[PDB]
């Protein structure tokens, strides 16, 4: 197991995690926008 | 600039298959992780599938084993194979790289699935 | 195009994306704090 | 200081930052859920 | 699949020490950053400690210098040494890799600290 | 520890230019991505500019082509050139690395732009 194999697997872990963190952010942005609409409606 | 040219959408019957393509210019798909997204009318953009620089893949739960992301490095093109399509998959589908999602979106490709 | 060129470009993509995800988080933290103030005020 | 030392230190920075961004997300998800409960309660 | 087998918890007196272990299969701990989390009853999962691929560490503020994360590459095992334990540390402790926290959690190891 | 020593701020007329400096110790700027932030009175800290390990740059929309981040590897120093300054740019400016923004901030450098 080379340094390059370790670097590659770290990069892969990071990219997978970034996609999951973005999806979580989008879910929460929808929830917050729904709350803002509830508190802002006439 | 980065160019994103999505194609391969259309009108398909439920249970049918599509293969979407995104022809990319200005970045190398064998260097960058690439994402497919979809957006149904009036709904938030949903991440659908990702392929990493070194070829690992992940899918949204809505894909549930039906979708396969891949790429051709020579054509600098990203593909999304979609099997067993359902009416709920009707949306405009977009390909992008994560560093540009704040910056530019292509025209997308319309996918309409009818029963 | 070497493995190192690929690794470098992946790292660059990741760092750019991390800065954008942080900015999105700060915007949303301000929005949530504004909601909390609206619901907490006397 | 080699290219590999630079790559390693970038990866390390990125992983530390990802753990911090996740912790911030969890704190905010708790705050948003508390707001949702306040606005949803009978 | 990835397997996560946590052990080393138990009942300990305040001021006591524990060393938790997570035996990992399906990924290499010397390739992947690895995290320890804890969850007290009815509370949100809290990140406790992280060790990066190249061995840098970070701790939650609640650790405040008491915890040390480490690994054995040959045993493919991650450890969390916990000194000067307090009743507030009572929780189930979990080890994971960040790319799988949306996907799978092991059974955890119960840590109970009594005065 | 990491040391961050910001300088180069001051009082400048609208349409004027500044070049901020941050002298860094304890990490190498040619190894770490480095960020410039600003904070106006009573407002949230805003990310202004980033430079990656391998020299790619990005700017907040408020910069809109006016700002240029750069570094000197020998002096281990990060720079922010700011052209066509506006009163709305009045703030304290801070340099940091992303892994330390939860941990430590320098004193910053005051930038005041008057018409």
- Rounded CA-CA distance B71/C9 in Å is 17
Interface of B with A (CB under 8 A): 33, 35, 44-47, 50, 52-54, 56, 58, 60, 98
DSSP-assigned letters across all residues of E10-52: EEEETT--EEEEEEEESS-TTTS-EEEEEE-TTS--EEEEEE-
- Rounded CA-CA distance B6/B35 in Å is 12
Residue E114, classified by CB atoms within 10 Å of its CB into exposed (0-12), middle (13-18) or buried (19+), is exposed
Task: Give the SS3 label for residue D21.
Answer: helix
Distances (CA, A) of F46 to C16, E54, F42: 16, 31, 12
Alpha helices, H only, A1-42: 3-40
List the domain range (segments joined by +) for residue B88: 3-114
Distance to chain A for B47, nearest Cα, Å: 7
DSSP-assigned letters across all residues of B19-82: EEEEEEESS-TTTS-EEEEEE-TTS--EEEEEE-TTS-EEE-TTTTT-EEEEEETTTTEEEEEE
Residue of C nearest to B32 (CA): C10
- Listed in sequence order, the residues at least 6 apart from D42 whose beta carbon sits closer than 8 Å to its beta carbon are none
Contact with chain E for residue D25, Cβ under 8 A = no
Of C8, C18, C23, the CB nearest to F54: C8
Residue of A nearest to B101 (CA): A22
Residue E54, classified by CB atoms within 10 Å of its CB into exposed (0-12), middle (13-18) or buried (19+), is middle
Of F44, F56, F58, the CB nearest to C30: F44
* CATH code (residue E28): 2.60.40.10
CA atoms within 13 A on the CB side of D9: 19
**Total of domains in chain F:** 1
Q: Which two tokens stand for residue B67?
A: 């979708």
Cross-chain residue pair C16–F54, CB shorter than 8 Å: no
Distance to chain F for D8, nearest Cα, Å: 8
Whether chains B and A touch (3+ CB pairs under 8 A) is answered by yes
DSSP-assigned letters across all residues of F23-57: EEESS-TTTS-EEEEEE-TTS--EEEEEE-TTS-E
- Rounded CA-CA distance B43/B41 in Å is 6
């Amino acid at each position: 197991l080379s340094l390059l194999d370790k670097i590659i697997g770290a990069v892969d872990q990071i990219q997978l995690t970034q996609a999951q963190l973005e999806e979580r952010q989008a879910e929460m942005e929808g929830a917050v926008q729904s709350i803002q609409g509830e508190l802002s409606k006439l | 600039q980065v160019q994103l040219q999505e194609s391969g959408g259309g009108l398909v019957q439920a249970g049918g298959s599509l293969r979407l393509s995104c022809a990319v210019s200005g970045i190398r798909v064998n260097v960058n992780a690439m994402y497919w997204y979809r957006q149904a009318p009036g709904k938030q953009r949903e991440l659908v599938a990702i392929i990493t620089t070194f070829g690992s893949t992940n899918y949204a739960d809505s894909a549930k084993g039906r979708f396969t992301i891949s790429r051709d490095n020579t054509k600098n093109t990203v593909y999304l194979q979609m099997d067993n399509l359902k009416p709920e998959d009707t949306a405009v589908y977009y390909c992008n790289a994560p560093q540009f999602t704040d910056r530019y979106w292509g025209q997308g490709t319309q996918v309409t699935v009818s029963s």
